[PDB]
Amino acid sequence: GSHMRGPNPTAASLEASAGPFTVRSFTVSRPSGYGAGTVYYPTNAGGTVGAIAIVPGYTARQSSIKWWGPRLASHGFVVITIDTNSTLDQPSSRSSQQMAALRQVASLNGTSSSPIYGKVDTARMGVMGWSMGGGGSLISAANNPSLKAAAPQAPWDSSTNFSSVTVPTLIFACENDSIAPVNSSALPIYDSMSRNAKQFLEINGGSHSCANSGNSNQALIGKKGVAWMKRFMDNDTRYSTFACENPNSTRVSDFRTANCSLE
C-alpha cells in the first residue's frame, strides 16, 4: 500500500528550499473550528496526496510555522497552517482545532468549487506544530491513531506521558530551549512513547524558535520533516534511509531513534 509521488529523492533534493511540484495557496474564507488558515497545495503531484495540519505556539500565529507550507507542499502534500481561535488557546484546544483544519481540508477536497477539489487522499493525514501546538499534535496523535505521522517541534504540554501514541513521531528539539526545556519536555515526551516508530532530533545551540520560519537549519530540518512525512504518510520506502538515519550533522547535538528501519 504505497502512494509514491515524485522522483527518487537525494540528500540534495531534500535539502533544497523546494521539492519538484509547483505550489499554490489560498486563505480559507470561512474557517470551521479554528481561527484562520492558509492552504498550500501541489498543482501537479500526479495523484492524490495526504494532508498535514500545522499549529503555532501560545501567542503565535501562522508566520512562526509558515515555511513548512511551501516546503512540504512542494514535495507532495496539502498543508494547512492555522491560527487558533484565540492566541491563548491551550494544547487540548489546539489539538481540536488542528483536527478541525484537517476536517475542513477534507471538506474542500469534496467541494467542486475548491482549488483542492480531488487533490487529497483524506485517509492519509499528519500533524505538526510548535510548542503548545506541538503538544497539541501529540494529543491529536494519541486521540486519533489513524493519523499516519506526527512531527512536532519544541513541544510543550503539562503532561509528558504520550505512551499511548502509535503514530510515527519525529520530535524536533532545540538544545538550549528555555521555554520548554529539552530535559523536562521534549526528551521525556520522546521517552514516553514506547509503541511507535519515533525519532528525536535536537538542534545544536537552538533556542525555542529553532525550527520556525527563518531558522538557520532549514536544509536539515526540512529534509527530515519531509522525509518523515514521505516515509510514513506515503508508505514510501524510498525515504526509509532519509527518515530513519542519523543525519551526521554538526548542526545536531542529540539524535535518537527507535523502530525505524533504514531499508
Residue numbers in the entry: 30 to 292
What text comes from the article?
To elucidate the molecular mechanisms of IsPETase, its crystal structure was determined at 1.5 Å resolution. The structure reported here comprises residues Ser31-Gln292 visible in the electron density map. The asymmetric unit in the P212121 space group contains one molecule of IsPETase, indicating that IsPETase exists as a monomer. The size-exclusion chromatography experiment also confirms that IsPETase functions as a monomer. The substrate binding site is simulated to form a long, shallow L-shaped cleft on a flat surface with dimensions of approximately 25 and 29 Å. For binding of the first MHET moiety in the subsite I, the benzene ring is positioned on a ravine between the two aromatic residues of Tyr87 and Trp185. Compared with TfCut2, IsPETase has an extended loop in the region with three extra-residues (Asn244, Ser245, and Asn246). Interestingly, the unique conformation of the extended loop in IsPETase allows the formation of subsite IIb and IIc by constituting a continuous cleft from subsite IIa. The disulfide bond is also conserved in IsPETase and formed between Cys273 and Cys289. Interestingly, IsPETase has an additional disulfide bond between Cys203 and Cys239 in the vicinity of the active site.
Recently, a new bacterial species, Ideonella sakaiensis, which can use PET as a carbon source, was isolated. The IsPETase structure belongs to the α/β hydrolase superfamily, and the central twisted β-sheet is formed by nine mixed β-strands (β1–β9) and surrounded by seven α-helices (α1–α7). At the active site of IsPETase, three residues Ser160, His237, and Asp206 form a catalytic triad and Ser160 is postulated to function as a covalent nucleophile to the carbonyl carbon atom in the scissile ester bond, as in other carboxylesterases. Based on the scissile ester bond of 2-HE(MHET)4, the substrate binding site can be divided into two subsites, subsite I and subsite II, where one and three MHET moieties are bound, respectively.
